Ligand binder design. Sequence first.
Ligand SMILES: *[C@@H]1O[C@H](CO)[C@@H](O[C@@H]2O[C@H](CO)[C@@H](O[C@@H]3O[C@H](CO[C@H]4O[C@H](CO)[C@@H](O)[C@H](O)[C@@H]4O[C@@H]4O[C@H](CO)[C@@H](O)[C@H](O)[C@H]4NC(C)=O)[C@@H](O)[C@H](O)[C@@H]3O[C@@H]3OC[C@@H](O)[C@H](O)[C@H]3O)[C@H](O)[C@H]2NC(C)=O)[C@H](O[C@@H]2O[C@@H](C)[C@@H](O)[C@@H](O)[C@@H]2O)[C@H]1NC(C)=O
Ligand SMILES: *[C@@H]1O[C@H](CO)[C@@H](O[C@@H]2O[C@H](CO)[C@@H](O[C@@H]3O[C@H](CO)[C@@H](O)[C@H](O)[C@@H]3O[C@@H]3OC[C@@H](O)[C@H](O)[C@H]3O)[C@H](O)[C@H]2NC(C)=O)[C@H](O[C@@H]2O[C@@H](C)[C@@H](O)[C@@H](O)[C@@H]2O)[C@H]1NC(C)=O
Ligand SMILES: *[C@@H]1O[C@H](CO)[C@@H](O[C@@H]2O[C@H](CO)[C@@H](O[C@@H]3O[C@H](CO)[C@@H](O)[C@H](O)[C@@H]3O)[C@H](O)[C@H]2NC(C)=O)[C@H](O)[C@H]1NC(C)=O
Ligand SMILES: OC[C@@H]1[C@@H](O)[C@H](O)[C@@H](O)c2nc(CNc3ccccc3)cn21
Length: 602
Amino acid sequence: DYVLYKDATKPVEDRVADLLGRMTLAEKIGQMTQIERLVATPDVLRDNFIGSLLSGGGSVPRKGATAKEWQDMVDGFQKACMSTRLGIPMIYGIDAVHGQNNVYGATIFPHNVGLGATRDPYLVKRIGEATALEVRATGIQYAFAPCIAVCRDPRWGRCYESYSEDRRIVQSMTELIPGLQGDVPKDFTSGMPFVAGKNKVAACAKHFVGDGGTVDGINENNTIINREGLMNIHMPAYKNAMDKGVSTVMISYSSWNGVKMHANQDLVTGYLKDTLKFKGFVISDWEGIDRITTPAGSDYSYSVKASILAGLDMIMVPNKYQQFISILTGHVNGGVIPMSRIDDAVTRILRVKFTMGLFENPYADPAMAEQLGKQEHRDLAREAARKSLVLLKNGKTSTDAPLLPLPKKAPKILVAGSHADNLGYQCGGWTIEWQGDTGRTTVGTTILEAVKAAVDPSTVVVFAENPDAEFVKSGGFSYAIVAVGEHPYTETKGDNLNLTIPEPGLSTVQAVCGGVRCATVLISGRPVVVQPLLAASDALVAAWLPGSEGQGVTDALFGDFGFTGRLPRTWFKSVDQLPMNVGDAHYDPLFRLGYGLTTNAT
Ligand SMILES: *[C@@H]1O[C@H](CO)[C@@H](O[C@@H]2O[C@H](CO)[C@@H](O[C@@H]3O[C@H](CO[C@H]4O[C@H](CO)[C@@H](O)[C@H](O)[C@@H]4O[C@@H]4O[C@H](CO)[C@@H](O)[C@H](O)[C@H]4NC(C)=O)[C@@H](O)[C@H](O)[C@@H]3O[C@@H]3OC[C@@H](O)[C@H](O)[C@H]3O)[C@H](O)[C@H]2NC(C)=O)[C@H](O[C@@H]2O[C@@H](C)[C@@H](O)[C@@H](O)[C@@H]2O)[C@H]1NC(C)=O
Ligand SMILES: *[C@@H]1O[C@H](CO)[C@@H](O[C@@H]2O[C@H](CO)[C@@H](O[C@@H]3O[C@H](CO)[C@@H](O)[C@H](O)[C@@H]3O[C@@H]3OC[C@@H](O)[C@H](O)[C@H]3O)[C@H](O)[C@H]2NC(C)=O)[C@H](O[C@@H]2O[C@@H](C)[C@@H](O)[C@@H](O)[C@@H]2O)[C@H]1NC(C)=O
Ligand SMILES: *[C@@H]1O[C@H](CO)[C@@H](O[C@@H]2O[C@H](CO)[C@@H](O[C@@H]3O[C@H](CO)[C@@H](O)[C@H](O)[C@@H]3O)[C@H](O)[C@H]2NC(C)=O)[C@H](O)[C@H]1NC(C)=O
Ligand SMILES: OC[C@@H]1[C@@H](O)[C@H](O)[C@@H](O)c2nc(CNc3ccccc3)cn21
């Protein structure tokens, strides 16, 4: 017989309907199952008809693996999936959230908070375009990005993953989506999924909804706000995402007024699917369904029932697939979950797969391997890092000479601080490892390396990680650049009620700035207690988490370009003010949202 779903010339909806009508319950539930590469084998993928795989943070084939190694791994998994009766290709997902960040040698872009500081949606679109290429360089077809959380309290460990506390800025930055996926056609229906083809990736608007609204910024906690507030702060960017054809949406671990997002039928089905007319697939977060219950995982049968009935389509299991499949099959066999619900979930998963061309190009393109870490992409990351920088102070007092820009020619200069020569620190979380890491973890340029690359050949550059006051005072330095701040963190590990930088940080700044005029570069995922740093410093720059391209920092420090970044968040006076956002009745910032000093290029 002619087999319609295998015919590339046929309309997506026709191909979807034709395939679905041929599938067994096992094949259907298989599609709904996403597993870690760590538990995947060819036999597992074939025998369970698995629909998707992912790499969680740090889930890599080998340390330092090449783009070709990634492609071969993904293709090996694909070969097993394509060998099933129906030959439905799997989709492979990864957190490419500031470049293809799990991958050695991948360009690492500034994290979202810094991108918000640029107020440049086209820049962010271009980052999406570069990121898609580097993801496809590794054979991967699906990025879990953008995070369109609106972080309302910087005590949250994921505040750096939010473009802004201002939903309007977050909405503007949804341009990442057509960068990753390609621009939607003129004739496009909001809520339909879209991916242009094999050189683009499926995107994921996350985490639905109100992940940035939790009490005290406690990660995965309760967002207590009325529907009006939910709809005017936390929801708007999802509509923009719909308009731009985002292929998938990931559900939040958080709760809204005490109801777990992973169990919320009203919002997932009633709003996202039925009101926004989202036609892509809805994916859980990692063990998200497990965490519906307290303790987590204490009634997995309930978890499966609650999440599938709420309207989730694909479950990021990610390990215990046999149990997931067994429980879901049982619920269907028992009449507890209707076939219509399974058919809806599979319709959505297949729609995204057919739409993106997965059935036509299930395997990697070896010619794309060379896209990884391309200099053109690094030049883009360098531009972004520079544009993200916010100048908070430039001259110890209002009558002082402006410190920045600094001269490239001077007899001797000092570069200092825990963050001056630490690539892992300047990248932050979601870089090589889930939580990020310390030291030379990938290919890049540290602040020290950037300084050495920028200055006149006659200028002697001295590095001291934590020099004492006497070393600085007696050193014969013209000026110092001192870089300090937060260590890398991700999710709950980043939750922080005090928001003061680790030591030595302030002590180093005080020692250096006490001995010579100094420019302090603050590396952080968020505003942190800054008055003491300000007091010691002649100039201070909030550099956020600028990524692999340290020359973005020096491009502004030495005046090749002027400072243009503006705060995308309120800078508080103290943590006891929190939460405190622009528009609040009590608004007493140290620096308001939108604050930023400027310089002109030399
Ligand atoms: C304000 O709140 C902050 C968050 O709540 C808090 O930071 C946390 O402090 C706790 C200690 O109570 C840390 O937990 C421990 O971490 C130890 C190792 O920590 C190092 O390595 C990790 C990465 O693995 C980094 O994230 C850390 O920053 C730290 O880095 C090291 O820091 C040194 C000092 O600056 C550097 O010289 C060094 O180079 C650097 N090394 C690296 C690799 O970067 C573990 O050994 C412990 O076992 C413990 O881990 C916890 O164990 C309990 C378990 O439940 C947790 O899951 C597990 O995390 C925690 O890492 C840290 N969180 C951060 C930084 O994100 C502030 O504490 C201050 O700063 C820290 C760095 C310490 O110096 C504290 O003494 C100090 O008080 C809070 N500040 C205030 C004012 O109270
Ligand atoms: C010395 O520095 C100052 C301060 O940075 C320069 O003036 C700024 O120039 C920017 C670029 O032209 C102006 O930004 C633009 O603003 C308009 C109107 O709002 C807007 O339509 C543009 O899109 C752009 O806004 C940016 O868009 C991209 C975003 O990423 C970014 O956040 C937005 O700012 C900016 O308003 C202006 N600031 C002020 C206070 O005047 C100045 O540049 C010189 O003057 C400006 C007015 C312009 O004629 C430039 O061509 C000119 O060089 C600079 N001086 C020199 C000589 O370099
Ligand atoms: C928002 O965060 C708070 C604070 O973490 C959460 O409350 C906490 O809930 C946990 C269980 O999820 C409690 O810990 C447990 O305690 C029992 C002993 O009674 C122990 O057997 C378990 O091993 C576990 O340690 C904890 O007591 C509780 N903390 C507080 C301060 O109430 C809350 O559930 C979160 N809300 C949401 C919606 O996620
Ligand atoms: O890495 C996959 C997802 C990621 O896309 C989400 O943005 C993020 O919320 C996320 N967190 C985890 C891991 N969470 C976890 C849960 C229970 C135990 C250990 C880790 C996985 N993921």
